[PDB]
Amino acid sequence: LEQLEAQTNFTKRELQVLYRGFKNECPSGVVNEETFKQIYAQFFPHGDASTYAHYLFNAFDTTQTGSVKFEDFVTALSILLRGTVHEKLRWTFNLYDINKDGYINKEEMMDIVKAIYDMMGPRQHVDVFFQKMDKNKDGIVTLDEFLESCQEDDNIMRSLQLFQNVM
Amino acid sequence: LEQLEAQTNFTKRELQVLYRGFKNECPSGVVNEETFKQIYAQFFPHGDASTYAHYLFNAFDTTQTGSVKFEDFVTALSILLRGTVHEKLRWTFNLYDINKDGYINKEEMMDIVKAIYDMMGPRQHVDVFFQKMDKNKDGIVTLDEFLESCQEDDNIMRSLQLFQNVM
Amino acid sequence: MAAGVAAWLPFARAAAIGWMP
Amino acid sequence: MAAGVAAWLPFARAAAIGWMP
Ligand SMILES: [Ca+2]
Ligand SMILES: [Ca+2]
Ligand SMILES: [Ca+2]
Ligand SMILES: [Ca+2]
Numbered sequence: 001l002e003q004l005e006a007q008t009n010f011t012k013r014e015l016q017v018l019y020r021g022f023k024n025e026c027p028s029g030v031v032n033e034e035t036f037k038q039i040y041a042q043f044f045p046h047g048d049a050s051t052y053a054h055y056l057f058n059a060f061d062t063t064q065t066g067s068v069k070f071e072d073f074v075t076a077l078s079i080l081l082r083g084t085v086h087e088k089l090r091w092t093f094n095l096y097d098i099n100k101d102g103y104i105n106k107e108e109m110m111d112i113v114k115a116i117y118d119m120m121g122p123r124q125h126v127d128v129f130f131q132k133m134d135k136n137k138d139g140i141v142t143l144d145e146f147l148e149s150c151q152e153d154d155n156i157m158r159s160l161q162l163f164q165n166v167m
Numbered sequence: 168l169e170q171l172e173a174q175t176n177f178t179k180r181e182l183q184v185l186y187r188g189f190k191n192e193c194p195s196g197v198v199n200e201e202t203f204k205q206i207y208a209q210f211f212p213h214g215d216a217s218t219y220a221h222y223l224f225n226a227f228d229t230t231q232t233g234s235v236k237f238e239d240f241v242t243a244l245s246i247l248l249r250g251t252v253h254e255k256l257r258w259t260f261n262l263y264d265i266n267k268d269g270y271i272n273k274e275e276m277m278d279i280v281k282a283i284y285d286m287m288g289p290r291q292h293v294d295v296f297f298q299k300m301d302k303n304k305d306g307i308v309t310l311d312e313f314l315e316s317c318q319e320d321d322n323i324m325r326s327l328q329l330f331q332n333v334m
Numbered sequence: 335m336a337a338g339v340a341a342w343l344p345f346a347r348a349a350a351i352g353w354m355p
Numbered sequence: 356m357a358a359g360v361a362a363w364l365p366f367a368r369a370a371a372i373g374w375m376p
Pocket of ligand 4: 303
């Protein structure tokens with residue numbers, strides 16, 4: 001846990017708590033997509049959380065090997081529970097960037113929104129959000145454009161930022 | 168919204184988003200305990216969230232007048248969504264201090280835990296937590312003792328801190 | 335604490351949709 | 356983001372109960 005402590009916002013005792021919990025509740029030593037889906041389907045039982053769970057699982061699976069090891073699980077938790085707003089937004093951008101190419105296109109945003117609406121149990125609004133986010137009008141939202149609009153003081157962007165914070 | 172902006176972590180445009188949302192979804196201009204219970208019963212449908220909702224409502228109702236005005240709603244949200252860990256812990260202490268006397272006794276902690284377990288759908292563990300938290304052994308947990316143990320590096324306290332963060 | 339906040343997701347979604355003409 | 360975190364409440368509760376002898 002020494003290296004993990006040095007790489008995350010957790011002390012060794014916090015990592016021992018997470019580790020013990022991880023070894024008990026998840027014996028294979030990794031979190032598979034099936035587990036993510038179960039965790040979210042339990043919590044959002046009155047909707048279909050499978051797609052969102054899928055994107056979320058891919059967000060945790062940084063190596064894209066289909067297996068979230070303890071190290072990956074803690075790294076994500078470190079950011080989500082204790083990272084700066086800057087780190088949290090970057091983690092979120094990477095969640096929306098489905099195919100992990102470093103860009104978010106309108107379809108991808110559309111898929112993310114539908115996955116969220118499916119979880120909570122549309123198009124028009126997204127075309128409005130995407131247009132405001134794609135600053136240079138070239139059909140792709142880069143990390144820099146994402147950071148800017150998701151921290152800018154514009155009523156529409158503020159609305160979206162609030163939803164994302166609660167999300 | 169000028170004074171509110173000066174008193175919270177929200178800019179005027181963020182407050183306009185919250186205000187518009189508040190005027191639509193909650194026409195009386197205040198949030199009554201019945202609304203809090205409905206909001207939480209919806210989100211945690213497979214359990215009884217009424218008691219927790221009750222303590223939470225009392226936490227928002229700082230004036231203890233039985234009515235959460237927009238100002239009170241935003242003040243709480245400011246802390247929960249953007250306050251420092253110090254401010255968030257103080258807000259939380261006040262949530263657990265059911266009778267608002269500035270002290271948390273074992274019964275109160277017991278009630279809070281049961282309300283949470285009821286929401287998620289016991290005694291022994293709480294007697295262990297309370298004992299570790301009441302530093303001077305006088306049967307009451309003050310804000311200072313709460314802050315200390317809920318920021319200290321002890322495996323049991325770390326376990327509890329994690330649960331509270333996720334809670 | 336996150337669970338307490340998460341419960342306001344419907345309100346959040348409604349607040350955002352309230353500004354999308 | 357809070358909703359995503361909140362879903363891990365069962366795990367959190369289990370992790371805490373795992374240290375209470
Ligand atoms: Ca992409
Ligand atoms: Ca662009
Ligand atoms: Ca008290
Ligand atoms: Ca004491």
